[PDB]
Design a protein around this ligand. Structure first.
Ligand SMILES: CO[C@@H]1[C@@H](n2cc(-c3cc(F)c(F)c(F)c3)nn2)[C@@H](O)[C@@H](CO)O[C@@H]1Cc1cn(C(C)(C)C)nn1
Length: 138
């Protein structure tokens, strides 16, 4: 296991066709999970499952620039379940990040931060047991 929060370096940033895989288990009474693809202090891509926002489950995505959150992108399709093993795959494409959970496509997020080769860290936080975090080129 990996301690959470966890920082995965992404040496030399990200590039199209880079696939980042996060494996773990959702805690039984989970409230929130977050992935933060960072360019220094900026968050190029924040991926944030919320298990109980107003008695809904929702996926919130956003970007943080100079410590300011931008416009949220929200999804009600919610593939996570408390207590279960999960896989999140984030595939970097030329114009977006593409996210699949448990081998099912979830969402796309267009690039707001354009210096892909400076997005050099992935933070992983929240209500998970983290098993692995890695990357490969497809
Ligand atoms: C409440 O703060 C949220 C942000 N957040 C979550 C975590 C977080 C931290 C952990 F350690 C976790 F384990 C974990 F799962 C999530 N950190 N920051 C982030 O989600 C932001 C996305 O827009 O929305 C919130 C902040 C926000 C939003 N807005 C608008 C755009 C509506 C005006 N202004 N401020």
């Amino acid at each position: 296991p990996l301690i959470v929060p966890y920082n995965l370096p992404l040496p030399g940033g990200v590039v199209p066709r880079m696939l980042i895989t996060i494996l773990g288990t959702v805690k039984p009474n989970a409230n929130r999970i977050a992935l933060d693809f960072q360019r220094g202090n900026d968050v190029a891509f924040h991926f944030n499952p919320r298990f109980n926002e107003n008695n809904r489950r929702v996926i919130v995505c956003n970007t943080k620039l100079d410590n300011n959150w931008g416009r949220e992108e929200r999804q009600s399709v919610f593939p996570f379940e408390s207590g279960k093993p999960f896989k999140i795959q984030v595939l970097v494409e030329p114009d977006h990040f593409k996210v699949a959970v448990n081998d099912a496509h979830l969402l796309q997020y267009n690039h707001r931060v354009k210096k892909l080769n400076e997005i050099s860290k992935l933070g992983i936080s929240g209500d998970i047991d983290l098993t692995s975090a890695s990357y490969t080129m497809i």
